[PDB]
Subunit: 246 residues, 3 copies
């Protein structure tokens, strides 16, 4: 048993909705320090790490650390019914379902049966990112979108004072450039000229759920994975780790 | 002949659009006291009563009480072309069509042939409602919508200080609760604990055309019909009478 | 080579998008006085004339007058990615593609291969328009739309103090009337009572890309073509010449 409460059900729906983009099924670790979740897409190309500490919850009462299995699509169809000014209550009895409550103009309660989830325990090799990039969400989603007009894959090129996302076609070619003079670029650190490429289908599902002025941080290296971070209520962290196109 | 005028064509389109949800064909009684319409859905599960008195019309000139037949879909495709600041003019000559005019930035006139409509004359048995409920439209449409995630039918349960719309599934279950402490509940009177169930497909079409902050009144009894009211310009009344699931 | 710049990429996308409605392929004449384009729909029923003078461009640098061929759909899929506050740069090297750049939160560059376009040189017979009409875009698009409920074709009837767009059916009939008392009518000059008819499918594609409060001027004559003008930044001119239904 636990009772966990989040003010603004529509925001929380958005996290879940984002993770649901690549995840079908996930195991949620619920501790007193917080809630965490680690899953992979079906193709095992994307890793997802979600970390929701106590501090972003209005009431966090975990008596008996616990892991629960959740079908991510049925969870997101339910959360999508919560409205922006609703209070969300995730609560668990001695049974095997998640109580999901929206409290706003009314008390609306759903019961979502908890499932049995394959808890693969695997993690990380070398993480020698030689590049760090912070940009506005709308650049990144624009970039994924423009490149999709042209190609399968998008190449990330980080140099000097330049970050470049480039895609090329059989006649067309697109290229998005960000220098520190640009409004869309919040930060750029480059230990070494770095080139790498990623599947646009994957990138696209990663950034669907990303907001207007959201700040996203990318870390990557030459022909190695792409790490994409963005923060939730300043203390939540959603991380994607994307395999490169080789 | 008659000339009837309504300021705000888009509002009137909305009534008609709502009634059109369950009605294909209808007969409109046009008198000097007002306009009224009584029809049933094809399955004869829902009764619709619409009452539009003189007082909600800017000009109401009925010389020769008259009943006219209208195809409800062709009427609603036409009314859907009227814009919010348009003045609506429903006018009839000695011919067999309805003149529908929108007057705004321009005079736009449609002619809708009047049809021959089966005027079944039937009405009401016992109406021993042991429960009355007034709630915000957005609760009701949220409620119909959440339950549709789970089930065929939605059970209405009115007790003490509680109103409850509940649906259950084969694994999932949803429940919407309203007490007078709640913002969404405007009024609750319960002569006796009352339980009854309704088809969600029917409920859904009943509340599609219902507005944000609209106030809806429900009256029902145990295993008997559901009456749903809401008002139009404070003096119009649209009523649904819904057969229970038995 | 040339460099041409337009502040507000989304506006320019809208011109192009409008012309693209009837045009698949077009040749763009680029001179020092401005940019112009003349094309016809596949059915050779509509003529399109587009004129974009230097004065509507923030930077206009044409060294070597030049004509370029453009696939209109690939150009409009690209321009549709420019956002409202973007600066648009159309630039050309000694190669055979158009550089399309959006400069805003970032530098986004597309390369659109220039094509080979059938440059038919044909133009105009008698232009004895006996009627001139200026109206709000929302009337015209409403009018095309209401008539589509009823018929293949829309008849334009200009008299005294009256302009009338009328369509009739096999039971239904629609009629839109504009007199100088009306808000939607900005101007009306009638040398002679004028009647003519046009295909609604064509009209509809002509006015899709037309704005809320846009002012459109129609000139036509009895059973002769319809000329439709509207202006861009007060000095751009997009013209349609539509064959009548005979």
């Amino acid at each position: 048993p636990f009772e966990i409460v989040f003010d603004g059900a529509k925001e929380f729906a958005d996290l879940i909705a984002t993770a649901s983009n690549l995840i079908d099924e996930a195991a949620f670790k619920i501790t007193e320090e917080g809630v965490s979740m680690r899953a992979m897409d079906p193709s095992r190309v994307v890793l997802i790490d979600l970390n929701l500490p106590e501090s972003i919850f209005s009431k966090y009462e975990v008596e008996e650390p616990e892991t629960i299995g959740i079908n991510m699509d049925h969870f997101k169809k339910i959360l999508k019914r919560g409205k922006s000014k609703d209070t969300l209550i995730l609560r668990k009895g001695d049974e095997n379902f998640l109580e999901i409550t929206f409290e706003g103009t009314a008390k609306r309660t759903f019961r979502l049966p908890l499932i049995d989830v394959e808890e693969l325990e695997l993690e990380l090799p070398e993480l020698p990112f030689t590049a760090k990039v912070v940009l506005l969400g709308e650049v990144l989603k624009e970039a994924i979108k423009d490149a999709s007009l042209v190609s399968d894959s998008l190449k990330f090129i980080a140099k000097e004072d330049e970050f470049t996302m480039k895609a090329e076609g059989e006649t067309n070619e697109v290229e998005i450039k960000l220098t520190l003079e640009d409004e869309g670029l919040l930060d750029l650190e480059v230990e070494e000229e770095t080139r790498s490429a990623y599947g646009i289908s994957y990138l696209a599902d990663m950034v669907k759920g990303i907001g207007k002025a959201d700040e996203v941080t990318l870390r990557f290296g030459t022909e190695m994975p792409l790490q994409m971070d963005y923060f939730i209520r300043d203390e939540g962290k959603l991380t994607f780790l994307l395999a490169p196109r080789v």
